[PDB]
Swiss-Prot record, chain A:
Entry-annotated residues carrying Phosphothreonine: 42, 45
N6-acetyllysine: modified positions: 50, 83
Name this protein carries in UniProt: Large ribosomal subunit protein uL5
Disease: Diamond-Blackfan anemia 7: A form of Diamond-Blackfan anemia, a congenital non-regenerative hypoplastic anemia that usually presents early in infancy. Diamond-Blackfan anemia is characterized by a moderate to severe macrocytic anemia, erythroblastopenia, and an increased risk of malignancy. 30 to 40% of Diamond-Blackfan anemia patients present with short stature and congenital anomalies, the most frequent being craniofacial (Pierre-Robin syndrome and cleft palate), thumb and urogenital anomalies.
SUPFAM superfamilies: RL5-like
Gene Ontology MF terms: 5S rRNA binding; RNA binding; structural constituent of ribosome; ubiquitin ligase inhibitor activity; ubiquitin protein ligase binding
Organism for this UniProt entry: Homo sapiens
Primary localization class, coarse: nucleus
Function text: Component of the ribosome, a large ribonucleoprotein complex responsible for the synthesis of proteins in the cell. The small ribosomal subunit (SSU) binds messenger RNAs (mRNAs) and translates the encoded message by selecting cognate aminoacyl-transfer RNA (tRNA) molecules. The large subunit (LSU) contains the ribosomal catalytic site termed the peptidyl transferase center (PTC), which catalyzes the formation of peptide bonds, thereby polymerizing the amino acids delivered by tRNAs into a polypeptide chain.
Record gene name: RPL11
From Swiss-Prot, chain B:
Positions where Phosphoserine occurs in the chain: 184, 271
Glycyl lysine isopeptide (Lys-Gly) (interchain with G-Cter in SUMO1), cross-linked positions: 219
GO cellular component, one term: cytosolic ribosome
N-acetylglycine: residues bearing it: 1
CDD domains per record: Ribosomal_L18_L5e
Residue location of crosslink Glycyl lysine isopeptide (Lys-Gly) (interchain with G-Cter in SUMO2): 219
GO biological process: cytoplasmic translation; negative regulation of protein neddylation; negative regulation of ubiquitin protein ligase activity; negative regulation of ubiquitin-dependent protein catabolic process; positive regulation of gene expression; positive regulation of translation; protein stabilization; regulation of signal transduction by p53 class mediator
This protein's name: Large ribosomal subunit protein uL18
Compartment(s): Cytoplasm; Nucleus, Nucleolus
Organism: Homo sapiens
Curated annotation (Swiss-Prot), chain C:
Record's protein name: Ribosomal protein uL16-like
Species in which this protein is naturally found: Homo sapiens
Keyword vocabulary terms for this entry: Cytoplasm, Differentiation, Disease variant, Meiosis, Ribonucleoprotein, Ribosomal protein, Spermatogenesis
Phylogenetic classification of the source organism: Eukaryota, Metazoa, Chordata, Craniata, Vertebrata
InterPro entries the record matches: Ribosomal_uL16 (IPR047873), Ribosomal_uL16_CS_euk_arc (IPR018255), Ribosomal_uL16_dom (IPR016180), Ribosomal_uL16_euk_arch (IPR001197), Ribosomal_uL16_sf (IPR036920)
Tissue: Almost testis-specific. Also expressed in pre- and postmenopausal ovary.
PANTHER family per UniProt: 60S RIBOSOMAL PROTEIN L10
Curated annotation (Swiss-Prot), chain D:
UniProt-recorded name of the protein: Large ribosomal subunit protein eL21
GO cellular component, one term: endoplasmic reticulum
Matches recorded under PANTHER family: 60S RIBOSOMAL PROTEIN L21
Lineage of the species this protein comes from: Eukaryota, Metazoa, Chordata, Craniata, Vertebrata
UniProt cross-references to InterPro entries, sorted A to Z: Ribosomal_eL21, Ribosomal_eL21_CS, Ribosomal_eL21_sf, Translation_prot_SH3-like_sf
Organism: Homo sapiens
Length: 176, 293, 202, 159
RNA sequence: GUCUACGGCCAUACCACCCUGAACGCGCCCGAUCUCGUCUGAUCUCGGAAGCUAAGCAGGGUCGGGCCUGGUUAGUACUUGGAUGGGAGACCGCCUGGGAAUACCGGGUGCUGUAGGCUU
RNA sequence: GAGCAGAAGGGCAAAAGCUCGCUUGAUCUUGAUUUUCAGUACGAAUACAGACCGUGAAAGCGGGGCCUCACGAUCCUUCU
RNA sequence: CGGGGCGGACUGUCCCCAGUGCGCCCCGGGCGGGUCGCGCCG
């Protein structure tokens, strides 16, 4: 009771940027259409990603237009989460959670939820990578008087999973 | 047992630490060198700098010149000392930045004995004004603005203190480009919306925006404006009284309070005998607990 | 195919190791420096015998290999194949050049590697049982004939190859100032974390 | 044989000390170099402008000209058979005040104020410095203790 | 006894982890109307004051790692000058002066300037 | 432990590196000095001083490249 | 080689436990340095 209800207001596990991403191994109209799904899904114009090495194995050169991604914060990131999670039926099973406290997953098809199929736009899939934080995690990105966050203010994988179960009643670690 | 350690013993043996105020992220030593270093053929002439530091609760303005043993402050002004006349709530805003800049200018020239000369701009227009020295009288006090680590974009509060100090009579080189009046596209200085920021009119139209549209979100935003009834009206007037109150008395006085005990609020460093003792009874405790079995 | 060792006996050429400046160096003749039971822990081999060389000369890599073989044949024959550990404490790092067939552009190309020794410096080391002292001295005495200079046999007061004296070795191991692992021991200073004292001493 | 480059052989001379790289401390910048005061030429390598030549590193001269960022130094250079006073412009990074001159100045004002007080009182005192005289015959107590007997240790071959 | 703003020296100040923090302050913090920046008010800019020391920060702890400072290493290594000294040489000893560096073992772990606050 | 055009060496972290914005100080001049040196020249370089500018809010910074190399007399010719 | 009384801080012997430093003076022993020091002896 009182022994625990002291630090709750400022240690609360809060969802930071969603940083949704789509990567296509080529450029042009197909990539341009893949960009449009972000405005459909986020109402937020994404940015394009360039490749820095020419590998030629699967085929890409440097400074191409390869991937598009956007980062969503606030309530808009909140509902894009449960949109992707209800697609997954609240099932991230074992190890999608990183040791730094953030986790991610990938959806193969976007037309299921949300935006309705537009035959003009393609069949692209995408991967979400939600990062978690607490009030005070922004001092690492600050310009003046920057600093680390301290050991006991970090987020471990286990406490990230506890937050997911406590907030969405998710299912983690099937006995496999 | 899988990855090579980076911060190993050899890492710290040859790790060279940065300057302490660089580590704390408070001083930009690249800019500080160009800002405080005097020409070598002046030999004693101080390079006065106007330090403007805008804080979460306060605004700090001081004039300094750099010596070997450390900077020397000749006069400083604080936004938390503004409520002693006129404006009492609404600090750390652009209208507060101008006032503490003006207050800093006034109390400096008053201390130098040249307050009656270089009156600056008693009437306030948000336009270009640079003081000039008067022949036959001591020249204008010239100093340079130290924005620090703040990003100097158009309409930064660090330039609000510049306008206040230069309206007070300090000859600070600058341009009207980084003032709230300036318009990036047509490259013009409106200089009337600048004067609106100085008298806090942008905030004033913010409050009057909220009242008609909302009540509870209005008192959540301006909670302390409601106390003692700081209405959007008479907000230009209270800044005029603040500006005139600065001209009349800019002098600073502090308060005597020595009726304080000698309480220690930290814990003193443990001594060698305590440290040696502590490991000693840690040895026996481990051995006794082991032997209890 | 090789010049006499008298042509490169003396350390007079400003150590010239194999590096990015000296490339195309042939491999040294000696590649094995430890023989016998290299796995005996610390205790079965408390007797350490050394060949110290009291001359500032350089010994070739083929001579180091030849003396190592000579000491291995005797120690195996007498003390048994598992009754000793040998350590050649000299590595042939210096590179000697040869000006092949007049004096124009005379800087020679690498031809071999030698090891430079000082007045006090061990060439070979043997640790073994205590009762094998006579066999160790004899094995070293024979291997000394394969080197140009003059060398001494010295029965070290230290326990085996460990840097701590044999008389006090047992009692610091007893009070855990030393812990044994591998061929040697680990010194345990009383100035680390206390948790590491309690995982030991318990 | 060897080149005549202006920084040949300065691999370590202009290198920074261990764990002393990076931002130049600013106290070196507010030192005030008058005209006619004695300075040591060092030549730090962090600043590449206005650095001296390698023949003036570790040499001492007198300032004859003060500029915005540098000073003019009259420093003796010994060419083969003769010494001539060279005038070099060197940025203030690469110099520092010689406290050989500072130590002499503090002595002089000590002698001057000792000269005054000697006259005021009317006594006589010594002013110059003498070269470490012999050692003033004294007594050495044994305190009832026999001096320890020493004896060379026998030779034992350790290593 | 402290803390802020600007600093000087730039680890005795750093790194890792744990504990404590009264009051001012510093922050976290709330918001995007204006100024201003973004893919994203996350950073930057601006407007605030519901909550909180959780983090930053400060003080302390660690048979802590580093760093600083001593002892040992050691009058050892090396070295100025000398001999019709030794030795086949390699090298070595002596005379006259100077004189280190690891391993190992202790001690310490920021000092301070200007201006302004808090502490019965 | 990267990069800074190249050989190597030195130097560099809210840099000297990377990305943007604006620009032409890679402009016009006079002497002093350093480097090789005979204290000759050339080359390169350093401190200024006098104009005209660029950039920045400003302090400042910049008359080529972070520094150490990257170059050329008399006579003749061409241009201004 | 330490004795009395007051404010913190440590130990897994923690209500009956133990151990360390610093704070105030009151003392106890030995060591060194100045004192017209004061005497005696050479
Ligand atoms: Mg800046
Ligand atoms: Mg032959
Ligand atoms: Mg030779
Ligand atoms: Mg040469
Ligand atoms: Mg060469
Ligand atoms: Mg340059
Ligand atoms: Mg330690
Ligand atoms: Mg000697
Ligand atoms: Mg300018
Ligand atoms: Mg000029």
């Amino acid at each position: 009771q009182d022994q625990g209800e002291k630090e709750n207001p400022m240690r609360e596990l809060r969802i930071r940027k969603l940083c949704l991403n789509i990567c296509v191994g080529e450029s042009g109209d197909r990539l341009t259409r893949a960009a449009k799904v972000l405005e459909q899904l986020t109402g937020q114009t994404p940015v394009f990603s360039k490749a820095r090495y020419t590998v030629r194995s699967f085929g890409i050169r440097r400074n191409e237009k390869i991937a598009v991604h956007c980062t969503v914060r606030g309530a808009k990131a909140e509902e894009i989460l449960e949109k992707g999670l209800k697609v997954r039926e609240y099932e991230l099973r074992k190890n999608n959670f990183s040791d730094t406290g953030n986790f991610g997953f990938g959806i193969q098809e976007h037309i299921d939820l949300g935006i309705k199929y537009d035959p003009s736009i393609g069949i692209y899939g995408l991967d979400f990578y939600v990062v978690l934080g607490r009030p005070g995690f922004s001092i690492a990105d600050k310009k003046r008087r920057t600093g680390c966050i301290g050991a006991k203010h970090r987020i471990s994988k286990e406490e990230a999973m506890r937050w997911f179960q406590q907030k969405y009643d998710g299912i983690i670690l099937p006995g496999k | 047992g899988f990855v090579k350690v980076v911060k190993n013993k050899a890492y710290f043996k040859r790790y060279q630490v940065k300057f302490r105020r660089r580590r704390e992220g408070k001083t930009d030593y690249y800019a500080r060198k160009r800002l405080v270093i005097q020409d070598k053929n002046k030999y004693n002439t101080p390079k006065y700098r106007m330090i403007v530091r805008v804080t979460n609760r306060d605004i700090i303005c001081q004039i300094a010149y750099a010596r070997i043993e450390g900077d020397m402050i000749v006069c400083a002004a604080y936004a938390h000392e503004l409520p002693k006349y006129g404006v009492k709530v609404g600090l750390t805003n652009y209208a507060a930045a101008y006032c503490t800049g003006l207050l800093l200018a006034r109390r400096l020239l008053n201390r130098f004995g040249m307050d009656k000369i270089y009156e600056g701009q008693v009437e306030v227009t948000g336009d270009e004004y640079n003081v000039e020295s008067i022949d036959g009288q001591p020249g204008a006090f010239t100093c340079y603005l130290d924005a620090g680590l703040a990003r100097t974009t158009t309409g930064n509060k660090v330039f609000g203190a510049l306008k206040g100090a230069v309206d007070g009579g300090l000859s600070i080189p600058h341009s009207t480009k980084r003032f709230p009046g300036y318009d990036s596209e047509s490259k013009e200085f409106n200089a009337e919306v600048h004067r609106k920021h100085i008298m806090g009119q942008n905030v004033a139209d913010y409050m009057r925006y909220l009242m008609e549209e909302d009540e509870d979100a209005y008192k959540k935003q301006f909670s302390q404006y409601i106390k003692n009834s700081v209405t959007p009206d008479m907000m230009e007037e209270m800044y005029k009284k603040a500006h005139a109150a600065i001209r009349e008395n800019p002098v600073y006085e502090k308060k005597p309070k020595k009726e304080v005990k000698k309480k220690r609020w930290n814990r003193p460093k443990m001594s060698l005998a305590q440290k040696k003792d502590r490991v000693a009874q840690k040895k026996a405790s481990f051995l006794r607990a082991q032997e209890r079995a | 195919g090789r010049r006499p060792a008298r042509c490169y006996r003396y350390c007079k050429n400003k150590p010239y190791p194999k590096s990015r400046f000296c490339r195309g160096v042939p491999d040294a003749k000696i590649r094995i420096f430890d023989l016998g039971r290299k796995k005996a822990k610390v205790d079965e081999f408390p007797l350490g015998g050394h060949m110290v060389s009291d001359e500032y000369e350089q010994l070739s890599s083929e001579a180091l290999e030849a003396a190592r073989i000579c000491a291995n044949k005797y120690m195996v024959k007498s003390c048994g194949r598992d009754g000793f550990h040998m350590r050649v404490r000299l590595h042939p790092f210096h590179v000697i050049r040869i000006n092949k067939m007049g004096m124009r552009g005379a800087f020679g190309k690498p031809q071999g590697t030698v090891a430079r020794v000082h007045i006090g410096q061990v060439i070979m080391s043997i640790r073994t049982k205590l009762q094998n002292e006579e066999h160790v001295i004899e094995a070293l005495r024979r291997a000394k004939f394969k080197f140009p200079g003059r060398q001494k046999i010295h029965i070290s007061k230290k326990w085996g190859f460990t840097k701590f004296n044999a008389d006090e070795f047992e009692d610091m191991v007893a009070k855990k100032c030393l812990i044994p692992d591998g061929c040697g021991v680990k010194y345990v200073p009383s100035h680390g974390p206390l948790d590491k004292w309690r995982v030991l001493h318990s | 044989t060897n080149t005549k480059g202006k920084r040949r052989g300065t691999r370590y001379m202009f290198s920074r000390p261990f764990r002393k790289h990076g931002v130049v401390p600013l106290a070196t910048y507010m030192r005030i170099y008058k005209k006619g005061d004695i300075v040591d030429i060092k030549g730090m390598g962090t600043v590449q402008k206005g650095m001296p030549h390698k023949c003036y590193h570790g040499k001492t001269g007198r300032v004859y000209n003060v500029t915005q960022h540098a000073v003019g130094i009259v420093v003796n250079k010994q060419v083969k058979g003769k010494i001539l006073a060279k005038r070099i412009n060197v940025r203030i990074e690469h110099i520092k005040h010689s406290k050989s001159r500072d130590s002499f100045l503090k002595r002089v004002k000590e002698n001057d104020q000792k000269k005054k007080e000697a006259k005021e009182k009317g006594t006589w005192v010594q002013l110059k410095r003498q070269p470490a005289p012999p050692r003033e015959a004294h007594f050495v107590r044994t305190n009832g203790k026999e001096p320890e007997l020493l004896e060379p240790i026998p030779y034992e071959f350790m290593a």
